[PDB]
């Protein structure tokens, strides 16, 4: 028995992931371009107690080989877990999103997008039917400025991860959705 093309679904999942990553990336650039001079950035980076993200407890691949070696189910699962890990903590950047030159930035818009993609990935897993499968999402254990820039810094990274992992499952699952 044949199967319904996954393209419409992938197409919608991929628009949200890029919307989310887009907000993370701009939002972060903005804040960083106002309160964080390269000096603080470096000391932020060289001090894991401030830079090591909560989400980083979820074992994800770190380079191209690693990533393209994981099945679609694992990549979808990893992405699901990253999205769930941000449902609560996004309530924290309320203010940052508030004073931001928005363009869609708000803890609510961002949150509805998360709720949206979360469900969409769960659907994608049922269509495409380990630590990762036994592991739940990462709980956020928690100056203000160094707390926000950290939230933002982690939000951008995870969103880059999600958009990446989903893009990979997509090129594999959809007839030339990446080629020609």
């Amino acid at each position: 028995f044949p199967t319904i093309p996954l393209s419409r679904l992938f197409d919608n999942a991929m628009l949200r992931a890029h919307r989310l990553h887009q907000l993370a990336f701009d939002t972060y650039q903005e804040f960083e371009e106002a309160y964080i001079p390269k000096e603080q950035k470096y000391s932020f980076l060289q001090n894991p107690q401030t830079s090591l993200c909560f989400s980083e407890s979820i074992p994800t691949p770190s380079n191209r080989e690693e990533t393209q070696q994981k099945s679609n189910l694992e990549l979808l699962r990893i992405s699901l877990l990253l999205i769930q890990s941000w449902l609560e903590p996004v309530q924290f950047l309320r203010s940052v999103f508030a004073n931001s030159l928005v363009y869609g930035a708000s803890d609510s818009n961002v949150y509805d997008l998360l709720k949206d993609l979360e469900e969409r990935i769960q659907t994608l897993m049922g269509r495409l039917e380990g630590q990762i499968f036994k592991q739940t999402y990462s709980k956020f254990d928690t100056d203000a400025l160094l707390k926000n820039y950290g939230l933002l810094y982690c939000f951008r990274k995870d969103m880059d991860k999600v958009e990446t992992f989903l893009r990979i499952v997509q090129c594999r699952s959809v007839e030339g959705s990446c080629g020609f």
Binding site: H18, H21, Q22, F25, K41, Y42, L45, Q46, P48, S51, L52, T60, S62, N63, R64, E65, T67, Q68, K157, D160, K161, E163, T164, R167, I168, V169, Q170, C171, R172, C178, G179
Partner: protein, 192 residues
């Protein structure tokens, strides 16, 4: 001395170039929980050219911070911390070309190719292009909104003028814009 720049052309490898005595480059990256790894000197001083350091796929990882330092006999000449994903900046599109789409004005269709090192076909990269064109004698360029595709028509070009086109690309939502392709000169057919 000072860092000229560090960049990753395809999100798989990167290199750094800089502008006393013999300048050395040291780097470390957070592996595991903490920055536990001692500084190691540049693994390759030849590949990316004079005054550079090339980190192949074996030393390149994404979403993990790195820190590099330029050293001399007097001490640290420069420091820089980043994670490869922030330094992506793809090579220029190749095989630029045009063709008439279809007599004072003419409409053409420009097409190029993605940089050969960019794994677009498998999902690791997603580029967008920015095309620019102008009359060969003017000094400013007309920009064009970014596109996800590798063909784009340019409308209403005056046939009595020669034009130039250059396209540049960038990883979506990441990095900055890379180099421009070699220019494409466009001389249209004129019906006397």
């Amino acid at each position: 001395p000072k860092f000229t720049k560090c960049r990753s052309p395809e999100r798989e490898t990167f290199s750094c170039h800089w502008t006393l005595g013999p300048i050395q480059l040291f780097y470390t990256r957070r592996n595991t929980q903490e920055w536990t790894q001692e500084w190691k000197e540049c693994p390759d001083y030849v590949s990316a050219g004079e005054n550079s350091c090339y980190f192949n796929s074996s030393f390149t990882s994404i979403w993990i911070p790195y820190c590099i330092k330029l050293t001399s006999n007097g001490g640290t000449v420069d420091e820089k911390c980043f994670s490869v994903d922030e330094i992506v900046q793809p090579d220029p599109p190749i095989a630029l070309n045009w063709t008439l789409l279809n007599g004072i004005h003419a409409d053409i269709q420009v097409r190029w190719e993605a940089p050969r090192n960019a794994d677009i076909q498998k999902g690791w990269m997603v580029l967008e292009y920015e095309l620019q064109y102008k009359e060969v004698n003017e000094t400013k360029w007309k920009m064009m909104d970014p596109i996800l595709t590798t063909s784009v028509p340019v409308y209403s070009l005056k046939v009595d003028k020669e034009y130039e086109v250059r396209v540049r690309s960038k990883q979506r939502n990441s990095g900055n814009y890379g180099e421009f392709s070699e220019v494409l000169y466009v001389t249209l057919p004129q019906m006397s």
